[PDB]
From a paper:
3-H4MK is the key intermediate needed to synthesize pyrrolo- benzodiazepine (PBD) antitumor antibiotics, including sibiromycin and anthramycin, in Streptomycetes123.
The apo form structure was then solved by molecular replacement. Superposition of apo form and binary complex structures indicates a rotation of the C-terminal domain of approximately 22° toward the N-terminal domain36. When comparing the bound and unbound forms of Ss-SibL we observe that the peptide backbone from strand β6 to helix η5 is shifted by ~4.6 Å to constrict the active site upon substrate binding. In the apo form structure, the nearby acidic residue Asp132 associates directly with Tyr134. Therefore Asp132 can assist the deprotonation. Based on these observations, a step-wise reaction of SibL can be proposed in which cofactor binding first brings the two domains close together to complete substrate-binding site formation.
Residue numbers in the entry:
A (entry chain A), B (entry chain A): 4 to 344
Write the structure that this text describes.
């Protein structure tokens, strides 16, 4: 019936239950101190009993907590987040939704209409990019980067698990930025060598990320503009991590053809980012995440379908083009291809 | 796994998909014009194609719309809302969540802490009730009442379906206000007679609601304060519709004992409102609806469990105490009892 409307019609409230449990330390409480009674919870969090009962009904109905014989535990998802070392990441991301995303999401309608970021009315400035606007509010700059680091840390396992890194030798990371993915990649695969190709400005951060990891031997940098300049030869594999999502389809063909001439015959290209399902029915994560991308940043980020991306690789001349859609909950994956010999 | 986090972590966005489809007329469009292609939708709504694709992915992932061979229909829930004549009610309620509830919900945390309505910071005033604060913003007064009328219209069927109204003769509606429930009740049950017991102020609205329906014969009014004054005798059944939810448990016992002395032996008391499940695990509607009740109004509304209410009826001397929990999606029901002979 209409029951499916409930988590949507009250969706903003559903979020607030998670937001609250995070800010008031409920989930951490239930993690450290096992089963606790409503009254024990109410005490530990210094909340009016009425308030605690309400919060606990919220969190329990959502499956964020369970209640057995008067005692409250974390539910399956929150339980798992702790077990897998994800809690600080999940807490930080929820804090991001609270302080950055929540209020501007109310400008989705106007953003869809005007095709611009209508939500930026909540962050007055004269400049034309999100962080500068955010930096005008004390606290938000720091949170913005903490959030971005958290989001990345949610996805980066699926990149490292990609089987191609146990067969390629020299990887060219296009727009590799702060080398964090490059370092991680190099640690997980010791014989592998990685070149971070990016703008001079970003590479100063990259040489420090590389240095701290003491990987100055296997992880090099190469100053270039990924569009105008040409790519260094002798690379076995070309990687675009979160690159193809801000460019026009034709601009993506330019980059991929650049990957094709640069990579060695037999070589691989790997496109790693978030993908929409080909039938455009999901996945829900991507679908709901677009509200942020539609409402806040000035630059339009697009999540292309797997099939879209597969098509570009073929237009650029790659063969053995296919996809790697591994579980689980995030919509991140890899589209891949080879240059022939 | 963590998949259950998605509709919660992005819950505010999930709401925005419904909000958008309502404001831009998508669901009405898909209702009137059958299956439409993304491009046809994009055209009719005057949206950038990018915008329409995003909205449609949102709505389709949520099950609000379905897509078959390039053509979009309304999904099961939205389909049903139209079929059952509920669309204007659902549209109005969604408009309520958009303009009144959404932004203050971000003050849930502070509301739980302070036990007061922290969300009212968004509606500056010197007075101490919600509507006055809302009336200071042009448009909101009118929307507030339109919303309230819509919410009521969602629940009032479950009251009328209550079997007791085919066996009682004279009903005393305690705090019956604008007689809308009294009129409806009288129309659906022609032999029934109804007395609206309320404050003189409310009864002036009630005599007009009664008059328009030309039911001045079967629907009377009786000026009283439900706490200090006494109740008129000769009534077969005493009704509290949405009454027990703003009072302290002891204040509810006072009202119910008043119901007991006033009702005739053999008579019924009917408590009709929204109920929390006894195990406090739901229902989700009630659980998420509390964010509004915690953040905006100055008066604390409580949704008591069925068992709580059943207990009060017993403390007031009623027998044959039980509950009527009929489907479907709203948490509204009836707790009932009899005075013995």
């Amino acid at each position: 019936e209409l029951s499916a409307l409930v988590p949507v019609l009250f969706g903003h409230a559903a979020f607030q239950q998670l937001n609250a449990g995070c800010q008031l330390g409920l989930f951490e409480l239930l993690h450290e101190r096992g089963p606790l009674s409503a009254e024990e919870v109410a005490d530990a969090l210094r909340l009016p009993r009425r308030s605690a009962d309400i919060l606990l009904l919220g969190t329990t109905a959502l499956g964020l907590s369970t209640v057995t014989d008067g005692g409250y535990r974390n539910g399956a998802p929150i339980g798992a987040a702790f077990r897998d070392g994800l809690w600080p990441v999940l807490r930080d991301i929820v804090q991001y939704q609270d302080k950055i995303a929540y209020q501007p999401a109310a400008d989705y309608v106007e953003s869809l209409r005007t095709g611009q970021n209508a939500g930026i009315r909540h962050f007055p400035g004269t400049t034309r990019d999100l962080y500068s606007r955010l930096a005008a509010v004390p606290g938000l700059e720091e949170l913005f980067y903490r959030g971005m680091h958290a989001w990345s840390q949610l996805s980066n396992p699926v990149l490292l698990a990609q089987p191609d890194f146990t067969r390629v030798h020299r990887v060219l990371d296009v727009g590799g930025g702060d080398a964090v993915n490059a370092v991680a990649l190099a640690r997980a695969h010791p014989s592998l060598r990685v070149t971070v190709l990016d703008r001079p400005g970003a590479l100063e951060v990259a040489r420090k990320t590389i240095a701290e990891a003491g990987l100055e031997e296997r992880v090099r940098t190469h100053a270039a503009d990924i569009f105008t300049d040409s790519y260094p030869a002798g690379h076995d594999c070309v990687l675009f991590a979160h690159q193809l999502v801000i460019w026009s389809p034709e601009q993506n063909l330019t980059l991929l053809r650049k990957a094709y001439d640069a990579v060695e015959p037999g070589g691989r290209v790997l496109v790693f980012n978030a993908f929409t399902d080909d039938d455009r029915t999901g996945p829900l994560y991507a679908a709901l995440d677009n509200v942020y991308f539609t409402t806040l940043p000035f630059r339009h980020s697009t999540i292309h379908r797997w099939a879209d991306c597969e098509s570009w690789l073929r237009e650029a001349g790659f063969t053995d083009v296919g996809r790697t859609a591994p579980p689980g909950w995030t919509p991140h994956g890899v589209v891949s291809g080879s240059r022939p010999r």
